[PDB]
Design a protein around this nucleic acid. Structure first.
Ligand code: MG
Ligand code: MG
Ligand code: MG
Ligand code: MG
Ligand code: MG
Ligand code: MG
Ligand code: MG
Ligand code: MG
Ligand code: MG
Ligand code: MG
Ligand code: MG
Ligand code: MG
Ligand code: MG
Ligand code: MG
Ligand code: MG
Ligand code: MG
Ligand code: MG
Ligand code: MG
Ligand code: MG
Ligand code: MG
Ligand code: MG
Ligand code: MG
Ligand code: MG
Ligand code: MG
Ligand code: MG
Ligand code: MG
Ligand code: MG
Ligand code: MG
Ligand code: MG
Ligand code: MG
Ligand code: MG
Ligand code: MG
Ligand code: MG
Ligand code: MG
Ligand code: MG
Ligand code: MG
Lengths: 50, 64, 96, 85, 76
RNA sequence: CUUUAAUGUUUGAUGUUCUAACGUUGACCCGUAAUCCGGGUUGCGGACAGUGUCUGGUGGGUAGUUUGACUGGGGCGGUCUCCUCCUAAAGAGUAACGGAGGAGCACGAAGGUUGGCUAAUCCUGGUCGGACAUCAGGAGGUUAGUGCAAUGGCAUAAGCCAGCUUGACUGCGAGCGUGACGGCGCGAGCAGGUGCGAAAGCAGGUCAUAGUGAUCCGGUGGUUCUGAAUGGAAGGGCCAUC
RNA sequence: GUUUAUUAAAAACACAGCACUGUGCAAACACGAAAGUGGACGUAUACGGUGUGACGCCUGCCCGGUGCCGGGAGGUUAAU
RNA sequence: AGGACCGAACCGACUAAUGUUGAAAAAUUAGCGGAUGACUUGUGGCUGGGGGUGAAAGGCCAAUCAAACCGGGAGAUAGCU
RNA sequence: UUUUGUAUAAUGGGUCAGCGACUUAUAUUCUGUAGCAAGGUUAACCGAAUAGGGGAGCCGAAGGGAAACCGAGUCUUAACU
């Protein structure tokens, strides 16, 4: 059970987040994926968070 | 005396227009990162109590 | 509601909703019900004096639920847009 | 007296639920759209004309008609197709 | 954890923290050592082997997923 | 203002001194024909002891109860949920303390697309170098491979490599399958945005089937939905999630 | 000597003797929500508890565990 | 002199037989132990039920005791006959 | 009676006579029947009192949403083919 849950808070300001897992001891980098933001209805850049 | 209603069931079922009962789909409280989005969005709307369970609910709600 | 020992149906499913204090003080008026009140004025008082809504009810709505004949002036209420098309037809004035 | 003798155990004895795979609509059955014809684990039956394949390799109808079982192909691999009714 | 005094005080107080923690760490293994001779002992005639001690041993084995007090004096 | 040194002056901690609270199961006197009591006179302790409310520790001295089931009788031993194969009698399902193994995960690439490619093994030849390393051409044709068991599959590859990438999207969903139910699953197609491709198109995670936990209670973010005279707020609700 | 009145009279219990430990007197301890009482009209050569059990020779090693006694700096720690 | 000796009254209860719808809800016959002592007995008192008293057997507390009897909660509850 | 199964050597009963075990109040749903019918019906109480008053109230003719709210529609959703 190494993997740890994280969430990707949107940069578009609208409070929104996808949640996922990440192997934190082999992936020091922080994810930055482009995904849908239904509040603003546009594809924005999602950055990691708590 | 008047029949006391089961207060726990009165918070979970609501009688519809033709005598049925609507409830809220389970498995949508926590542990929500595992489940596929198709699974979650299908437990969001209301539901209808099955024919087998129908006998046990009308007993629990005599006044509704 | 005892299922033999397994979790019963009314504890296996989640609670939902909240009951509103405002819905206990509103009511609904049928269109067939406008011919009973008085010499042609409908208000909260003219209904609850005719045993039509509860004495402790402060809001009301008039729905297309029958057939109205006499012209009546709904003093202040929340006539829908279907019953309005049935009260203006019979010659009824509607205001606030 | 030595009446009752000790006994051993069994290292195994566990199993899993049955998945109810098989053919749900046999040939010659008039079937509607999007309904399930055969449940697979691999692909013993391939997808012919007017049928599809799910991620589970479940074969489902696409348009209404009759069910057809056929053995076309260079490697004699069985297909399923649906006519136009 | 903080410490008072000059720098050499910390070395002295830290060594006591390490020695005592080494002293209590061995004692915990001592109980768990003799609580595993008992789990595989014979029962006897009609006795039960209290589960107030089997569950405690289950909690002792689970607690062994803990910090190793000596980092390990890396050898080269 | 940053360090500092006294007079006091508020009380805070230790120390000593006094008497007036309090204690006296010390002496004497009276009510009193009275080794209880009450009062008075003195002596000795003395703001201690003791008691009241609050509080941490100890507390089988006492009290209320709990201490699973299957089982070829019970105890001991083993098992309890999930996946694969046989039993299982050529649709589905089907038991035993029947015969064998596995899981409680992993992966921002090991996912999506667009291109291209095809193994095991043996024989022959060749520096070290060999029974087995790299290389060349022959037979062979998947006996190889698949992230991890077994089964079913796989060349149009589902296996191997590379470029670009985020569809590991949001709202829905005809019609089905499987369960007593809770539920679990497969899904064409519609709308909004997106990736790859010249396009026809494909993409709602991974070749499929294990990798998991109801409800209650509570925590975090969003949303005027509600707000017990009114305006707020608290606290509830709905959405996402722990 | 005592004991299971009514299936067990014994190797069981008691015993004089020994050791440890508590108690400075309004004693420890016990019965009591408390006043009070027993201990005791006694005062450590006394009273309570615990184990052993005339007499004779003896009574070895272990303080890691669990208890108890002493410590008074440090760490953790309640009400206020 | 002595928790000395033998031994009737007195106190007890080791063995055996009879009796077990008995003469008796524990006795009779034949023997058996103590018998100046930690003895035995009359009369009157005191200790009360999670309590007493116990040379200690879970013994005794009105023919009843691993928590007396009487009344009440009370028609306790009984997935068992 | 209880059982897969009883002449069963499994339970119960000596026999006769008398007593002995699915009830009663309130509430809720379904069926039959009766009266009224988009209506039906009163409760406490008053009352020369099983009459007559009393319509406080209850059920029904409207649903959808957690809710504001809308209404023969409504909810979901930016919007639904
Ligand atoms: Mg939630
Ligand atoms: Mg359970
Ligand atoms: Mg009224
Ligand atoms: Mg106890
Ligand atoms: Mg009890
Ligand atoms: Mg109880
Ligand atoms: Mg018990
Ligand atoms: Mg059992
Ligand atoms: Mg079969
Ligand atoms: Mg068959
Ligand atoms: Mg892969
Ligand atoms: Mg290709
Ligand atoms: Mg791939
Ligand atoms: Mg796989
Ligand atoms: Mg307000
Ligand atoms: Mg909130
Ligand atoms: Mg006896
Ligand atoms: Mg006696
Ligand atoms: Mg005897
Ligand atoms: Mg005293
Ligand atoms: Mg002894
Ligand atoms: Mg010794
Ligand atoms: Mg003598
Ligand atoms: Mg003698
Ligand atoms: Mg004699
Ligand atoms: Mg005799
Ligand atoms: Mg008796
Ligand atoms: Mg008791
Ligand atoms: Mg009672
Ligand atoms: Mg009874
Ligand atoms: Mg039998
Ligand atoms: Mg027969
Ligand atoms: Mg016979
Ligand atoms: Mg018989
Ligand atoms: Mg029997
Ligand atoms: Mg009989």
């Amino acid at each position: 059970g190494i993997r740890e849950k994280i969430k990707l808070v949107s940069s578009a300001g609208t409070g929104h987040f996808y949640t996922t897992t990440k192997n934190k001891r082999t992936k020091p980098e922080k994810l930055e994926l482009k995904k849908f933001d239904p509040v603003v209805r546009q594809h924005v850049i999602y950055k990691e968070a708590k | 005396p008047k029949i006391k209603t089961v207060r726990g069931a009165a918070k979970r079922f609501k009688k519809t227009g033709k005598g049925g009962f609507k409830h809220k789909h389970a498995n949508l409280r926590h542990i929500l990162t595992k489940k596929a989005t198709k699974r979650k969005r299908h437990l969001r709307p209301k539901a209808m109590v099955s024919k087998g369970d129908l006998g046990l609910v009308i007993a629990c709600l005599p006044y509704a | 509601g005892f299922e033999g020992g397994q979790m019963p149906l009314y504890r296996r499913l989640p609670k939902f909703g909240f009951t509103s204090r405002k819905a206990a003080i509103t009511a609904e008026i049928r269109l067939s019900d406008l011919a009973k009140v008085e010499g042609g004025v409908v208000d909260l008082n003219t209904l609850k004096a005719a045993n039509i809504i509860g004495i402790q009810i402060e809001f009301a709505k008039v729905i297309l639920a029958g057939e109205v004949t006499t012209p009546v002036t709904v003093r202040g209420l929340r006539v829908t847009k279907g019953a309005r098309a049935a009260i203006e037809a019979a010659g009824g004035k509607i205001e606030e | 007296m030595a009446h009752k003798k000790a006994g051993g155990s069994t290292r195994n004895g566990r199993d899993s639920e049955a998945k109810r795979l098989g053919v749900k609509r046999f040939g010659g059955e008039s079937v509607l759209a999007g309904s399930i014809i055969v449940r697979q684990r691999g692909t013993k039956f391939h997808a012919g004309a007017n049928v599809g394949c799910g991620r589970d390799h479940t074969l489902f109808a696409k348009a209404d008609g009759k069910v057809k079982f056929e053995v076309k192909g260079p490697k004699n691999r069985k297909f399923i197709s649906i006519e136009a009714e | 954890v903080t410490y008072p005094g000059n720098y050499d005080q910390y070395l002295l107080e830290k060594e006591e923290a390490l020695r005592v923690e080494e002293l209590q760490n061995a004692e915990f293994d001592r109980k768990l050592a003799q609580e595993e001779v008992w789990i595989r002992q014979g029962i006897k005639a009609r006795r039960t082997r209290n589960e107030g001690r089997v569950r405690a041993l289950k909690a002792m084995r689970r607690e062994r997923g803990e910090r190793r007090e000596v980092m390990g004096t890396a050898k080269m």
